[PDB]
From a paper:
IN first catalyses 3′-processing of the vDNA ends, exposing reactive 3′ OH nucleophile groups that it uses to attack a pair of phosphodiester bonds within target DNA (tDNA), resulting in strand transfer. In this work, we determine the three-dimensional structure of the deltaretroviral intasome and characterize its interactions with its host factor, the [name]-[name]γ subunit. The deltaretroviral IN host cofactor [name]γ14, as part of the heterotrimeric protein phosphatase 2A ([name]) holoenzyme, interacts with a number of chromatin-associated proteins and potently stimulates concerted integration activity of deltaretroviral INs14.
To aid the interpretation of the cryo-EM map, we generated a high-quality homology model of the STLV-1 IN/NTD using the SWISS-MODEL server, and determined a series of X-ray crystal structures spanning the catalytic core domain (CCD) and the C-terminal domain (CTD) of [name]-2 and -1 IN. In the co-crystal structure with [name]γ, the short linear motif (SLiM) harboured by IN within the CCD-CTD linker is clearly resolved, bound to a groove in the centre of [name]γ; the previously characterised binding site for endogenous substrates of [name]. [name]γ is recruited to the deltaretroviral intasome by the LxxIxE SLiM motif within the IN/CCD-CTD linker.
Author numbering:
A (entry chain CCC): 212 to 218
B (entry chain AAA): 26 to 109, 123 to 142, 144 to 294, 299 to 372
The structure:
């Protein structure tokens, strides 16, 4: 439930 | 008293808001005499509780002056030296939980990270990371999310963090030091990994091979395994090419908790390119044909559930020639 980060 | 003189904010100003953070820096003893200053403890509890209901419910209250005041406060409470099977819990959770809550300020719509960048720097982010060795799960839970936010909002630290997590895993696998917040750290990476840009920078490619795979080999793997699996399958999804040393790595590092492997593998198979499947079908199946027999029962059943997978059974169909003889007839 942790949002993906546009690395 | 013993922390000045204040009260709820009906008045409206920010200077009051400042002072509350500031007397919320007054620390208390929850350990070496839990029964001390109970009235004062409750005040501090209420104050934090106040500030929270405030920052969530009324806009344009975060404002240039308060940034350093908020940070400073989070600094003064959380950055401490930690004590050392069933866990130890933070005696001070009744305060420290709200300091965790309150600091998520990070998520308030009018958080301008441009002002924040001044105070939420590398010196901070480090000692934040230092706290991931907390035995108390519900603290780690808080750090996991907190640190997540910081990454996704301060492009400026994205770099630095990556290095620092590297240097934890490296010390964890090699330098042999136990590092205690690995399942949380790993859940972070999954979302950093999902967001990775194409093509995978060969650095990421390498971290897979030198850090992510060796984790399988460690004794406590069960304790963080779900999240490890995610990172792996997130790689094999970004670049379908790494399948070859990934699966092999896994089969090498293979055994009980055979089941977890069995999970990771299906989750790996779910994303496998046909041309990449062939690369490992032979060794993979020899292994799997063993599990269907594996005396440990739930191992076998789990090995069985592969055959219910429509894609997996296509892949076998496509290749039944070489795969099928890896059962009897």
């Amino acid at each position: 439930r942790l949002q993906p980060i546009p690395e | 008293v013993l922390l000045h003189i204040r009260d709820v904010p009906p008045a409206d100003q920010e200077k009051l808001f400042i002072q509350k953070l500031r007397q919320c820096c007054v620390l208390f003893d929850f350990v070496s005499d839990p029964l001390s200053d109970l009235k004062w403890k409750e005040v501090k509890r209420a104050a934090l509780s106040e500030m929270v209901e405030y920052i969530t419910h009324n806009r344009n209250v975060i404002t240039e002056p308060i940034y350093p005041e908020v940070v400073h406060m989070f600094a003064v409470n959380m950055f401490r030296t930690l004590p050392p099977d069933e866990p130890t819990l933070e005696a001070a959770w009744p305060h420290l939980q709200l300091v965790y809550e309150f600091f998520l300020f990070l998520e308030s719509p009018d958080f301008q990270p441009n002002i924040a960048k001044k105070y939420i720097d590398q010196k901070f982010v480090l000692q934040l990371l230092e706290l991931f060795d907390s035995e108390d799960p519900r603290e780690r839970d808080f750090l996991k999310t907190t640190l997540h936010r910081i990454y996704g909002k301060f492009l400026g630290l994205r770099a630095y963090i990556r290095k620092q997590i590297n240097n934890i895993f490296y010390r964890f696998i090699y330098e042999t030091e136990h590092h205690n917040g690995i399942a949380e750290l790993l859940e972070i990476l999954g979302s950093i990994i999902n967001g990775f840009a194409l093509p995978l920078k060969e650095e990421h490619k390498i971290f897979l091979l030198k850090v992510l795979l060796p984790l399988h080999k460690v004794k406590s793997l069960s304790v963080y395994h779900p999240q490890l699996a995610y990172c792996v399958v997130q790689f094999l999804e970004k670049d379908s090419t790494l399948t070859e040393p990934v699966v092999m790595a896994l089969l090498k590092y293979w055994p009980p908790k055979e089941v977890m492997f069995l999970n990771e593998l299906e989750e790996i198979l779910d994303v496998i390119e046909p041309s990449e499947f062939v690369k490992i079908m032979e060794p993979l199946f020899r292994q799997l044909a063993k599990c269907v027999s594996s005396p440990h029962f739930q191992v076998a059943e789990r090995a069985l559930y592969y055959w219910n997978n429509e894609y997996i059974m296509s892949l076998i169909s496509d290749n039944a020639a070489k795969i099928l003889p890896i059962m009897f007839p």
